[PDB]
RNA sequence: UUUCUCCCAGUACGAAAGGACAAGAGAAAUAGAGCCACC
RNA sequence: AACUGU
């Protein structure tokens, strides 16, 4: 079957510059594993993203339906949603700016979380 | 259909392609997906699906009808579809 | 239930959203075949005199059973390229967006709080 | 003897056989999943299987604010404020995806419906998700919280001040003048409390249900 | 174990680190003053030594060493 | 500066060991980022603020690299 | 009732570039006929 | 401009 270990090994084969994997406890109602990936260029991002899905489709998953690829339009961030794992593939410079690893390592303590601000909705007159 | 008076209704209508989820043999209750025209406690006419896909479903069913008098094999009191989760079954965990 | 007008709250760290502004927000367009916008539905929001795509993450309309009814309308901005405008989301976000049809992994990859 | 509301049938022309069949499924399911006794105002933690997540369960804690439905389709709603966001989740008692039900704090509130807590101050509605279960006395009635919540500015989701709602858990005096109550009282409909045509008795039905439920056990 | 081997190997791991300038990387090279190391700077300096020789050095006495020969002695007696 | 500078040596060293014990992620990025974390933050901090940073790292150390897998 | 996506399949075809059918599945939308377990 | 079944 298609599992975490198989994909990461495939990620190594296609030479992902950055791979980060965060497991999630059952209490949180989200994916068991969240994965963050990197690639040098958009062309590399497209190639690696396609490779994982192509390997996924070939590697059993007959019970599971085909997985559509998200973010291919963006040249800097591509994300593929598999059954038990989600891999987000981006550029190294794009990776550090978003700091996805901080989000999951620090579930609610990430620094950029505080940077969010609010707005208003008052009656004009 | 339910009549609404001058405003309507009270017209014969048919709903097609309703699957059966379960049948209670003791009380002869059939559990059918979807809604059926008419009010509660209203008599309805039930016949095998006439859709082209289900042209010949009686081959795997009692061809003339089910005869309890024959008693070839006593049926369970409650008949369930495979997907249906029977009560008293373990709580479903999405694994 | 996001629809015409419908004062909304921009849950994002985007510069336009983050900066306070006097004008109440009048959402323009709902990116759906139907006219009603619910959680996970793309919408167009006017912020700071500019138009930016937004993704609904909460609504005050009564919802289906076994789900939490939010007390405020929450949205997240998404760029044209598909990447979120803001790098962080503060309000708790339902995790149903993952299974919802569409591209929601990026926004979920930006949502710290999940309920 | 605490008879759960769902077992009590409502008046109507529905076949009694349906209730008997529905009760059998309810009673059989209760063996699989234990449904603890609780009342509106009690804080509960409910374990439910997560469909969106894969092989993961979660527990949600909130104060029970409303009970609705009957039979196998009965549902209960518990409210809480999480990350400053008020959330109300309607849990169906007999849904197979509810793994377990825990009454963290078994208690009652002034009103049988706590929807007005949305208009009340957030602190009255804020409850810690990780709060541990508090002790309970079996040979006692559930504790009744008589604290009167303070409302937010006059514009509310519903006009609780009206006699129709007749909420006894709201500090109307602080936020409403006596004249405003008189305006609200214009909808008193005093004849309604005196009308015997709107009275439905289930005491005999409730008593009969108890033996049937215990007999199934 | 060879004391000279540790002395030049300890010096080697000190030499490996780039931030510190080995203007005078003697066997008695000091850290706080000779190398001008902050409280954190000495940390990674010990860490490079720890990696080479099997770590297991605790800081309770490591920050007291203050020179490669002193850690050399501490390495020598613990191996 | 720190409440105890000894924790830092134990804290930092374990991170490097975990990187060599961290298979699924890219070891190269983990090493550079972790060294940045110490260099970016520990240069200047206050005792109270430093306590939070070191405390989170200690839990980060003691919880299988804080969930990094 | 109509539309979109998927699948078939990066296959057929084609020097490459590029890129299908039909059959099947899933999503919606509207129209029509209904329904009240839930909201 | 808000307000409200306009």
């Amino acid at each position: 079957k298609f599992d975490i270990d198989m994909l990461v090994s495939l990620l190594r084969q296609e030479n992902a510059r950055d791979i980060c994997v965060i497991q999630v406890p059952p209490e949180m109602r989200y994916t068991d594993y969240f994965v963050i990936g990197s690639g040098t260029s958009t062309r590399h991002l497209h190639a690696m993203v396609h490779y994982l899905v192509k390997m996924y489709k070939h590697l059993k998953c007959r019970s599971d339906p085909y997985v559509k690829i998200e973010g291919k339009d963006a040249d800097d961030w591509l994300c593929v949603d598999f059954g038990s794992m989600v891999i987000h593939l981006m550029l190294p410079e794009t990776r550090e700016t978003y700091e996805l690893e901080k989000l999951w390592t620090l579930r609610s303590f990430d620094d950029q979380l505080a940077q969010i601000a609010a707005e208003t909705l008052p009656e004009d007159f | 259909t339910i009549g609404k008076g001058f405003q309507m209704g009270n017209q014969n209508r048919t709903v097609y392609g309703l699957k059966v989820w379960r049948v209670n043999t003791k009380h002869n209750i059939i559990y059918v997906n979807g809604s059926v025209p008419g009010h509660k406690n209203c008599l309805v006419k039930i016949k095998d699906s006439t859709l082209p896909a289900y042209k010949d479903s009686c081959k795997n069913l009692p061809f003339p009808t089910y005869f309890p008098d024959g008693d070839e094999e006593e049926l369970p009191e409650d008949l369930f579809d495979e997907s249906v989760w029977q009560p008293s079954e373990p709580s479903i965990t999405f694994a | 239930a996001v629809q015409k007008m419908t004062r909304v709250r921009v849950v994002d760290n985007s510069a336009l959203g983050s900066t306070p502004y006097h004008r109440p927000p009048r959402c323009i367009h709902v990116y759906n075949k139907s006219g009603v916008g619910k959680v996970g539905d793309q919408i167009l929001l006017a912020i700071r005199g500019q138009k930016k795509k937004a993704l609904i993450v909460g609504h005050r309309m009564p919802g289906s059973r076994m789900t939490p009814k939010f007390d405020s309308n929450n949205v997240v901005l998404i760029e044209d390229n598909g990447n979120p405008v803001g790098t962080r989301i503060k309000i708790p976000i339902p995790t149903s967006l993952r299974r919802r049809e569409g591209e929601y992994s990026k926004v979920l990859a930006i949502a710290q709080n999940f309920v | 003897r605490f008879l759960s509301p769902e077992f009590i049938p409502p008046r109507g022309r529905t076949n009694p056989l349906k209730f008997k069949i529905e009760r059998k499924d309810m009673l059989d399911r209760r063996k699989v999943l234990p449904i603890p006794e609780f009342y509106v105002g009690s804080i509960l933690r409910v374990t439910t299987a997560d469909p969106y997540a894969s092989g993961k369960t979660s527990q949600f804690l909130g104060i029970c604010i409303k009970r609705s439905g009957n039979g196998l389709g009965a549902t209960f709603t518990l409210r809480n404020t999480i990350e400053g966001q008020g959330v109300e989740i309607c849990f169906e008692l007999y849904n197979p995806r509810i793994q377990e039900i825990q009454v963290v704090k078994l208690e009652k509130r002034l009103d049988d419906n706590l929807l007005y807590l949305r208009d009340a101050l957030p602190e009255y509605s804020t409850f810690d998700v990780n709060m541990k279960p508090v002790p309970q006395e079996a040979c006692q009635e559930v504790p009744v919280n008589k604290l009167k919540v303070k409302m937010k500015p006059k514009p509310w989701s519903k006009r609780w001040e009206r006699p129709n709602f007749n909420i006894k858990g709201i500090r109307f005096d602080l936020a409403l003048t006596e004249e405003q109550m008189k305006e609200a009282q214009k909808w008193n409909k005093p004849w309604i409390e005196f009308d015997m045509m709107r009275e439905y008795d289930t005491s005999k039905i409730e008593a009969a249900l108890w033996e049937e439920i215990e007999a199934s056990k | 174990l060879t004391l000279d081997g540790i002395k030049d190997r300890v010096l080697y791991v000190l030499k490996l680190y780039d931030k510190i300038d080995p203007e005078k990387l003697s066997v008695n090279s000091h850290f706080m003053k000779d190398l001008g190391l902050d409280s954190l700077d000495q940390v990674e300096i010990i860490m490079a030594m720890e990696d080479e020789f099997g770590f297991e050095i605790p800081d309770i006495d490591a920050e007291k060493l203050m020179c490669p020969q002193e850690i050399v002695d501490y390495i020598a007696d613990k191996k | 500066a720190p409440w105890s500078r000894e924790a830092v040596l134990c804290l930092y060293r374990a991170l490097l060991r975990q990187g060599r014990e961290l298979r699924y992620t890219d070891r190269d990025f983990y090493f550079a980022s972790i060294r940045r974390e110490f260099r970016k933050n520990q240069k200047l901090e206050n005792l109270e603020a430093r306590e939070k940073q070191l405390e989170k790292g200690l839990v980060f150390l003691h919880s299988k690299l804080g969930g990094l897998i």
Side-chain angles (χ1 to χ4, degrees):
Chain A
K1 270 284 176 194
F2 204 67
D3 52 354
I4 179 176
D5 67 0
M6 187 63 210
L7 185 148
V8 297
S9 71
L10 294 164
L11 269 169
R12 297 170 221 264
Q13 174 172 23
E14 58 76 27
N15 188 357
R17 272 65 181 174
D18 205 338
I19 310 170
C20 286
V21 182
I22 309 294
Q23 197 180 351
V24 169
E27 197 278 329
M28 290 165 52
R29 301 194 275 182
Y30 199 52
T31 186
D32 278 321
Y33 286 98
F34 188 97
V35 181
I36 310 152
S38 176
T40 47
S41 73
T42 178
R43 319 302 167 218
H44 181 242
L45 267 60
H46 272 267
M48 56 209 298
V49 160
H50 283 134
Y51 180 47
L52 303 181
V53 173
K54 182 55 173 184
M55 290 302 308
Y56 156 79
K57 284 170 312 191
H58 171 71
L59 286 165
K60 305 200 187 156
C61 74
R62 186 267 190 282
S63 60
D64 195 73
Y66 292 86
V67 164
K68 300 293 97 178
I69 294 157
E70 305 153 332
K72 264 183 308 193
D73 56 357
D75 57 356
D76 58 2
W77 189 352
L78 286 75
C79 49
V80 183
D81 184 75
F82 294 95
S84 57
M85 37 173 182
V86 298
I87 306 92
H88 289 62
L89 305 84
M90 54 214 65
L91 308 172
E93 294 77 19
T94 289
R95 190 186 185 101
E96 60 87 3
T97 55
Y98 279 105
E99 264 164 25
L100 262 54
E101 56 266 21
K102 283 206 68 171
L103 188 163
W104 298 98
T105 49
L106 286 61
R107 277 297 306 149
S108 62
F109 296 93
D110 49 340
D111 62 324
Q112 307 176 351
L113 178 65
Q115 192 251 318
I116 295 163
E119 309 81 17
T120 69
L121 55 87
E123 291 82 3
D124 190 0
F125 283 121
Chain B
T1 65
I2 288 168
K4 297 174 180 181
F6 200 115
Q7 298 296 321
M8 179 155 60
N10 200 28
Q11 306 140 14
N12 284 288
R13 287 292 189 290
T14 305
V15 174
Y16 300 83
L18 302 187
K19 168 189 177 147
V20 174
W21 286 113
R22 139 180 177 182
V23 188
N24 169 291
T25 304
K26 173 182 178 45
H27 307 296
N28 294 296
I29 321 297
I30 303 167
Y31 295 5
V32 180
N33 194 44
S35 299
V36 165
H39 59 92
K40 307 213 308 294
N41 306 318
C42 192
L43 281 62
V44 307
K45 199 177 87 168
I46 304 171
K47 61 174 73 167
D48 285 323
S49 190
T50 74
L51 274 66
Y54 303 100
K55 190 182 295 306
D56 269 325
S57 53
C58 52
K59 62 177 292 300
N60 309 309
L61 294 156
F63 164 54
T65 183
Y66 179 78
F67 289 100
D69 186 12
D71 269 328
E72 59 280 3
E73 286 89 0
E74 182 181 351
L75 284 178
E77 171 170 354
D78 290 330
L79 309 169
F80 283 81
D81 170 80
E82 287 64 56
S83 59
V84 169
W85 165 88
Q86 298 147 358
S88 67
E89 282 187 54
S91 180
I92 293 165
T93 184
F94 310 110
Chain C
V2 177
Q3 50 189 353
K4 300 288 103 179
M5 314 299 164
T6 67
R7 275 89 63 188
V8 67
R9 185 146 74 87
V10 168
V11 178
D12 215 21
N13 54 354
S14 74
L16 307 193
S18 76
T19 47
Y21 194 71
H22 79 107
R23 182 76 68 194
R26 309 269 58 72
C27 79
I28 299 161
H29 180 75
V30 171
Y31 292 89
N32 265 357
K33 285 172 80 181
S34 59
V36 173
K38 304 283 199 81
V39 171
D41 303 333
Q42 276 203 19
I43 58 170
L44 184 61
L45 191 48
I47 310 161
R48 294 297 306 278
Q50 188 168 322
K51 305 183 292 299
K52 191 78 70 184
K53 288 174 197 304
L55 176 64
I56 303 167
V57 301
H59 66 256
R60 313 182 35 226
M61 190 87 174
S64 62
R65 310 312 91 70
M66 302 273 203
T67 81
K69 163 149 152 156
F70 293 79
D71 282 329
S72 64
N73 306 306
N74 306 133
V75 297
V76 179
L77 292 174
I78 49 174
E79 283 289 25
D80 289 332
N81 60 11
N83 313 328
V85 183
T87 63
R88 291 288 187 274
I89 299 152
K90 181 257 287 184
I91 293 303
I93 308 309
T95 56
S96 61
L97 296 173
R98 173 197 199 190
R99 298 309 174 213
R100 183 178 296 289
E101 303 85 344
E103 317 198 346
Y104 302 112
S105 295
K106 295 206 184 133
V107 170
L108 295 158
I110 295 314
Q112 283 62 233
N113 313 104
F114 283 129
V115 166
Chain D
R1 305 172 165 200
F2 159 80
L3 179 61
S4 197
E6 62 267 28
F7 289 88
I8 307 160
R11 43 171 182 203
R13 320 164 66 166
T14 175
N15 262 30
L17 171 60
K18 174 262 181 177
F19 294 127
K20 285 190 290 293
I21 296 298
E22 212 178 10
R23 277 197 297 274
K24 179 263 286 187
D25 302 347
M26 294 151 74
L27 291 159
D28 298 342
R29 171 54 184 283
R30 276 180 170 264
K31 284 189 289 283
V32 165
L33 170 79
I35 301 178
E37 157 179 345
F38 63 104
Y39 303 80
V40 161
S42 59
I43 297 90
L44 280 78
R45 178 167 25 237
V46 185
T47 318
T48 177
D50 312 327
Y52 310 108
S54 300
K56 302 165 102 194
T57 64
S58 172
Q59 275 186 307
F60 173 81
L61 184 144
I63 183 171
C64 178
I65 57 163
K66 165 173 177 286
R67 307 275 306 262
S68 281
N70 282 336
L72 200 74
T75 73
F76 64 94
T77 76
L78 73 170
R79 179 163 206 260
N80 199 330
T81 68
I82 323 297
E83 285 96 36
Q85 172 76 251
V87 291
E88 310 176 358
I89 312 190
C90 186
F91 278 92
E92 321 164 335
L93 285 155
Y94 301 93
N95 193 319
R97 74 200 211 79
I98 294 189
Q99 306 297 107
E100 183 267 335
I101 307 169
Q102 177 200 359
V103 186
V104 176
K105 175 144 179 38
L106 172 57
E107 63 165 355
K108 199 180 287 181
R109 193 54 61 87
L110 277 178
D111 302 285
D112 61 328
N113 286 330
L114 301 183
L115 308 182
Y116 63 83
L117 290 187
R118 308 166 184 179
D119 296 302
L121 265 290
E123 67 95 19
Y124 298 99
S125 303
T126 308
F127 301 90
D128 178 29
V129 177
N130 317 111
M131 74 166 63
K132 279 76 69 176
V134 303
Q136 275 81 236
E137 312 182 35
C139 301
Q140 291 280 23
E141 294 64 24
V142 299
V144 181
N145 188 10
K146 290 177 189 63
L147 165 59
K148 277 182 160 286
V149 309
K150 300 192 177 192
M151 314 302 285
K152 68 165 51 60
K154 184 61 172 79
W156 296 332
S157 62
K158 293 178 182 187
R159 59 184 67 251
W160 310 110
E161 60 275 19
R162 285 282 169 92
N164 57 1
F165 289 98
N166 206 356
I167 306 301
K168 288 91 169 166
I170 289 175
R171 294 211 61 75
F172 280 119
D173 48 12
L174 307 197
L176 277 74
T177 76
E178 71 284 14
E179 303 89 1
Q180 286 169 315
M181 309 304 303
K182 282 143 51 182
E183 196 285 330
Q185 283 311 297
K186 286 179 197 170
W187 284 256
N188 181 29
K189 292 210 188 137
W191 60 90
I192 285 189
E193 70 182 1
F194 290 116
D195 65 2
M196 304 176 278
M197 283 294 322
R198 266 180 185 104
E199 80 204 355
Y200 175 45
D201 178 14
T202 60
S203 310
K204 181 182 179 178
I205 310 172
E206 288 166 46
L209 281 172
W210 188 252
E211 299 92 8
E212 289 138 28
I213 292 163
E214 295 313 315
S216 178
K217 301 308 212 322
Chain E
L1 57 86
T2 50
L3 299 178
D4 294 337
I6 304 160
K7 283 159 197 169
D8 70 357
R9 179 51 57 150
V10 164
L11 213 67
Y12 169 66
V13 298
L14 276 296
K15 190 83 76 189
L16 282 175
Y17 187 55
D18 54 321
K19 197 173 74 193
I20 64 162
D21 185 5
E23 55 91 20
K24 192 261 284 177
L25 202 71
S26 290
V27 180
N28 197 27
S29 168
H30 195 272
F31 296 157
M32 282 300 105
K33 64 101 176 175
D34 183 8
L35 264 50
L37 302 193
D38 197 1
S39 310
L40 192 78
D41 298 337
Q42 57 86 29
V43 178
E44 52 192 358
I45 287 291
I46 301 304
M47 298 311 89
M49 174 280 300
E50 286 180 354
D51 186 66
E52 173 47 62
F53 283 135
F55 48 92
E56 70 175 1
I57 295 93
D59 188 26
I60 181 54
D61 75 330
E63 74 192 355
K64 303 323 183 304
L65 312 160
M66 296 318 307
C67 50
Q69 96 273 4
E70 185 56 27
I71 182 68
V72 161
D73 298 332
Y74 184 37
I75 298 158
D77 67 8
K78 76 163 73 83
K79 298 288 100 174
Chain F
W3 188 265
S4 67
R5 180 54 73 179
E6 295 74 45
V8 184
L9 280 76
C10 296
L11 199 149
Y12 181 105
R13 191 64 183 77
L15 272 298
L16 271 284
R17 306 166 183 177
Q18 292 302 326
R20 311 158 208 165
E21 276 285 324
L22 197 57
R23 283 290 192 193
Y24 301 130
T25 72
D26 282 351
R27 285 136 166 275
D28 173 18
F29 171 74
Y30 166 93
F31 290 135
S33 304
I34 288 299
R35 298 191 86 163
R36 170 202 50 77
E37 271 164 52
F38 292 88
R39 285 167 194 187
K40 65 98 175 181
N41 220 334
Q42 274 80 325
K43 297 287 100 174
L44 73 166
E45 298 181 356
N46 296 26
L47 280 64
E48 186 60 36
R50 194 168 279 264
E51 276 161 1
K52 298 148 193 155
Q53 180 281 313
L54 63 87
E55 167 63 1
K56 96 201 167 187
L58 184 56
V59 179
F60 198 74
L61 188 165
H62 276 63
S63 289
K64 293 292 102 178
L65 193 60
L68 290 182
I69 283 293

